[PDB]
Amino acid sequence: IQELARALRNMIRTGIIVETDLNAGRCRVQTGGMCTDWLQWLTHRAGRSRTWWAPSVGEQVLILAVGGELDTAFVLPGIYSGDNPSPSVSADALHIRFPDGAVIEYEPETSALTVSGIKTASVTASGSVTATVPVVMVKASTRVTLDTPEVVCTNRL
Amino acid sequence: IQELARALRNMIRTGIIVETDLNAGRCRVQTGGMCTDWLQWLTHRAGRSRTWWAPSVGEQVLILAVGGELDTAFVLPGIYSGDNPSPSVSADALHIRFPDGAVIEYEPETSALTVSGIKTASVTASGSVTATVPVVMVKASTRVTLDTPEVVCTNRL
Amino acid sequence: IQELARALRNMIRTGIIVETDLNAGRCRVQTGGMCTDWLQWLTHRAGRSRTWWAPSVGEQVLILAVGGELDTAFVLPGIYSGDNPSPSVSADALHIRFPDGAVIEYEPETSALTVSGIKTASVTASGSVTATVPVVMVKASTRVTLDTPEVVCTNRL
Ligand SMILES: [Cl-]
């Protein structure tokens, strides 16, 4: 029958985000000769842990229709394109490129953890922050301020 | 035929996690008028790099059936709900909210990297940990301990 | 009809990565009695933010065919296997295991943020890096170097 085939071909589609609604957490997607209604996108976690990282206009995605009584569809980022190419060719590295030019990266080849291209950086811990490593370098252009009752240097200078 | 249509509608479904098996890495999901058998969930990576971040009871997910000789199905988190709403409305930020209230976040708008709401924090490196930035502030309520043969302050006090 | 059923069963498949092309960002996958052509894989983000974390040979994945005029298919990691088992059983923790043995982990149970098993670690910020916590420990086997015009210890020693 002719629409079982229509339902099957529309079950999984690919397309481009054309509009986002950050409050609703929904987007509209151009796929084939139409633009979808407002669809939710899948995120990494939406349970006891919750992630948020909104897809952007121009981002290529899959659209998965559930069909049935419900008949909703969901958006799943993301697919590399000419406009949005892979930011790396590394065999094993996790590489994250933010639109401000910042990079978060771990490269298992050199075992190098890299954060760069940012302005601010804050860690607020209630108990302990420790660091255990042969060499530590701080290159402060302005000054390092040590707001504490106490600093123990263990040996020499 | 009437079950091609049944297979098609059951190919992609949405539902809610009702039980987890952390040892097996499987979950059961309520979808429509039934609860699935124990299904594996998809994770970010399961190769040379491996991720683990178990979905939780109450989390809304997609279920994707492979059909065929195999006929298995897999669970894919996650979809925002009333119980589990988006933890942010930020246009570009990666925002992670843990159930202990901790937040990991980078906001490209302010280029601010944020870790907060945690107790402990440990970095164990075999070689070098360096930090290159104009201003550095440490606000230790108790004390900072510098267990090293040597600390070079490069200029003044 | 006999190939609506063939299209339906081939719509969603599972298989194993047998070859990768890091430049093209494509992989070939063994599924059933065949190996696919070069298929793109889905990544976390491919928009204003862009992620890269290539799947590896031996990694079990889903393959999603879009059918239709396009008829392409996309690869979605990842599924735990005997070769690539879950690196954790933790109820709430995000756990990342790199092939160099490094671990990135937050465990909400103990509220402990863990980075370990790495060699290098660099943060390059243009403005501020601050840290706000009762206890701070640095255990430098070799030396800590403070390349700054100024360090203010706020009280005592
Ligand atoms: Cl992800």
Running DSSP on this structure, what letter comes out for residue A42?
P
- Residue B109, SS3? coil
C-alpha span between B79 and B76 (Å, rounded)? 9
A33 exposure class (CB count in 10 Å sphere: 0-12, 13-18, 19+): exposed
**CA-derived radius of gyration, chain A:** 23
Asked if residue C44 belongs to a known ligand binding site, the reply is yes
User: What distance in Å separates the CA atoms of residue C155 and residue A149, rounded to the nearest whole number?
Assistant: 5
CB C46 within 8 A of CB A96: no
- Between the two ends of chain B, the Cα-to-Cα distance in Å is 84
B window 114-153, beta carbon within 8 A of C: 115, 117-153
Q: What is the dihedral of CA B100, B45, C86, A64, to 10 degrees?
A: 80
- CA dist., res. B46 & res. C76, Å (int): 11
User: How, if at all, do strands B73-79 and B60-65 pair?
Assistant: antiparallel
Q: Which residues is C130 bridged to in the sheet? A: A122, B137
Using CB atoms, pick whichever of B46, B141, B148 lies closest to residue C144: B148
Comparing CA positions, the residue from C142, C122, A145, A104 lying closest to residue B131 is C122
**C146: CA distance to ligand 1 center in Å?**
37
Contact A148 B140 (CB under 8 A): yes
**Residues of chain B positioned with their CB less than 8 A from the CB of C33:** none
Residues C55 and C17: beta-carbon distance below 8 Å: yes
Cβ atoms of residues A140 and C129 within 8 Å: no
Q: Which CATH number fits domain C85-157: 3.30.70.360, 3.40.190.10, 2.60.40.150, 6.20.150.10?
A: 6.20.150.10
- Interchain proximity C77–B46, CB inside 8 Å: yes
**Angstrom distance (rounded) from CA A27 to CA C65:** 22
Report which of A11, A44, C74, C22 is spatially closest to residue B86, judged by C-alpha positions. A44
B64 lies within 8 A of chain C by CB: yes
Q: Where in chain A is the domain with CATH 2.40.50.230?
A: 1-84
| Interior angle at CA A122, CA A117 and CA A123, nearest 5 | 130
How many angstroms separate the CA atoms of C91 and B17, rounded?
Answer: 14
Contacts of C67 in chain A (CB under 8 A): 8-9, 11-12
Contact by Cβ (8 Å): B59, B84: yes
Q: Measure CB to CB from residue B98 to each of C14, C78, C108 and give the nearest one.
A: C108
| Residue ranges of chain B that CATH labels 6.20.150.10 | 85-157
Report the chain C residue with the minimal C-alpha distance to residue A14. Answer: C66
* Cis previous bond, B78, omega within 30: yes
* CA-based nearest distance C33→chain A, Å: 23
Joined tokens for residue A13: 């589609």
Contact C106, B75 (CB under 8 A): no
Domain A1-84 has CATH 2.40.50.230: yes
Helix (H, G, I), strand (E, B) or coil at A53: coil
- Apex CA B22: angle with CA B17 and CA B28, to 5°? 30
Burial C9-36 (b: 16+ CB within 10 A, else e): bbbbbbbbbeebeeeebbbbbebeeeeb
Among the partner-chain residues A91, A99, A125, the one whose CB lies closest to the CB of C49 is: A99
Resolution in A: 2.0
A81 φ, ψ (degrees, to nearest 5): -140, 180
What is the H or E stretch that residue C63 is in? strand C60-65
**Distance from the CA of A127 to the center of ligand 1, in angstroms?**
29
**Contact assessment for residue C50 and residue A86, using Cβ atoms and an 8 Å cutoff:** yes
Sheet holding C120-125, edge to edge: B151-153, C143-146, A135-139, B128-132, C120-125, A112-118, A103-107, A94-97, C50-52
User: CA of C5: which chain B residue's CA is closest?
Assistant: B4
If residue C124 lies in a helix (H) or strand (E), which one and from where to where? strand C120-125
Q: Can you name the residues that pair with A41 across neighbouring β-strands?
A: A75
Q: How far apart are CA C6 and CA A9, in angstroms?
A: 13
Crossing angle between the packed helical segments C4-11 and B4-11, to the nearest 10 degrees? 20
State in Å: Cα C137 to ligand 1 middle: 33
> What residues does C122 pair with on adjacent strands?
A114, B130
Are B111 and A125 in contact (CB < 8 Å)? Answer: no
